[PDB]
Amino acid sequence: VPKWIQLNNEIMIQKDGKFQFDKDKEAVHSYFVDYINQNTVFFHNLKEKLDYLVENQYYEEEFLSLYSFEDIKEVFKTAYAKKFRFPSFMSAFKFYNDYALKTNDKKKILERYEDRISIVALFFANGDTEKAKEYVNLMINQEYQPSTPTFLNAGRKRRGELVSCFLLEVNDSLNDISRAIDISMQLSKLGGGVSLNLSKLRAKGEAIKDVENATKGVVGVMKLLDNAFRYADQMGQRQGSGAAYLNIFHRDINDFLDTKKISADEDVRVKTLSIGVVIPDKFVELAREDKAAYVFYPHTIYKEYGQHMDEMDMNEMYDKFVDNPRVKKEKINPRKLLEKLAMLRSESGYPYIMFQDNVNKVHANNHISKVKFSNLCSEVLQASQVSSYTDYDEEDEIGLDISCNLGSLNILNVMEHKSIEKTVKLATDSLTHVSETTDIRNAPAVRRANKAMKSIGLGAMNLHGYLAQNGIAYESPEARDFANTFFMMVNFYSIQRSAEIAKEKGETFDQYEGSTYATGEYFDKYVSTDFSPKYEKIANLFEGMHIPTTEDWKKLKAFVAEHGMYHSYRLCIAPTGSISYVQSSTASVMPIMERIEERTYGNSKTYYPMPGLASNNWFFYKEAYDMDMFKVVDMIATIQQHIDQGISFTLFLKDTMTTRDLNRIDLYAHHRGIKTIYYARTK
């Protein structure tokens, strides 16, 4: 048993009726001094280390050549000037096991935390020494954390893509289905999670060019995609993860849900394909009034109207679909479908719930397209256009497939540094750079949408950690007040930075002129409502920091009207799974699942107290399962009103709660404006 593992295990040994939280500092110190400093390759000078890394196919010479070696040396000096110390053993362990650069035989360590941060900053700045130093200060202070793909792969020769979330539209054709399988395998090969919209595919028992009842439906494509993701398993390193989305009004919705039942047949069940259900307000209205609902065959609707069923507004077109004799449909019970959804989420956590009209009522790019589905993590909500992949000899009609770059602000570190504006703007610049430097050669729609939309996702994390370390309960109204003010400021400065980038480059995103940013409809609630804190305690948290006012929002609206907006989408709160340990932060804006995290690595078990956990703030670190899910919905809806994309919203459920309770939580989330629901986690 390692000495650091023993020291970390002494936290649970209760001394004087309290956990020995101070043992984790001893644990991380022992871990470093006994393992990391021994296994860290050291070089006489930074020049020798850099030369070894570039010449041994570890780094990319292209981005490092943009600086003189003096500038790189000063950047590394800035990284090491902070003397950053990992507060807990788990932070250092996670970094040096997941993100630190290792030898080709994975025996020694080439990169420290400062080295990784310096390389990421030098890649972000793209030749600017002052910008690189600013990125170094931002990341070594741990105010901003680039996503796992960006943080892990930036500046590496043998790297995967810096983007890991992709959203593909699948057209109702064999050519398009085969192309979707190919693109899914190509993107999973790069290590990215792929989400596929299956709503355009015609249901089971539909006609294929005069041969009636010939289509296997969305479940055959589901099996094809599941096997495609199983094959494209990231070179046998990490299991290929993909998601499939279907509209709740699709005829195959019941077959779509049956793929996740525990009793599902092996010719129906899918293993590596997550499922998400898109629910328009029409379905919730039908279930509310207990009226019997209809699911429609998409190809009949396409033949009758020339438009896909998911391309049309179900709220206005549902009655026309039902009254149309040429549109084929089957009666369903919407309340029974909701109960089936809740039962499936209780059993397996699936499907994801995307409230279509909650997303699109505040969507800023409805002119481009409505948001029809989400990503594998249920936070990316962007307009997509389906591609028409024709025969081999013909020319394909390339659409827009969603792919955004992820980054997370550390709310605790941003708040303690009083640097919401600077951190938000620098994170926006880094995400923009990642967007520009991303080129995917086998997904033409993804590449076209990356070039045109220039969408980024700037998330946040350590919300519960910051609140509990400041004596604020997560469910308290003061917590929602802080979230309101903080994310209003984040949105303000992200919009300001996007407009500044548009002014600097003289270009906006494609079809910006039709957006609500161009017409000013986006800024209505910001120029009409004041989002300053309503509590003296919360207003004291923002001391020394200018909170944007109504006049500031009017000035921003005028600036955006004059100069445009560079990013179609800016903010999305991803789960931030493994980077939260490195940042000593609670995952995303979700509340903590456990106060002290018990995990086993190898044959040794490890203990991870939540960051900042102590005796004084023990009960402010309330576990998510002990919380009222209605208040968590209230918090996420408070945050969601300032996030243009969605938020990964995990439901934390007790074992005693019923199917009716899960349905009530989902319906209250729909009522409160929640866009997506990620997971149903039961204790």
């Binding site: 109960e339 039962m343 059993e347 709660m657 009522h671």
Partner: peptide, 14 residues
């Protein structure tokens, strides 16, 4: 399988 319970209305109103 926690416990299936039907939606008995007034769960759609808040």
């Amino acid at each position: 399988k926690a416990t299936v319970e039907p939606l008995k209305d007034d769960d759609f109103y808040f």
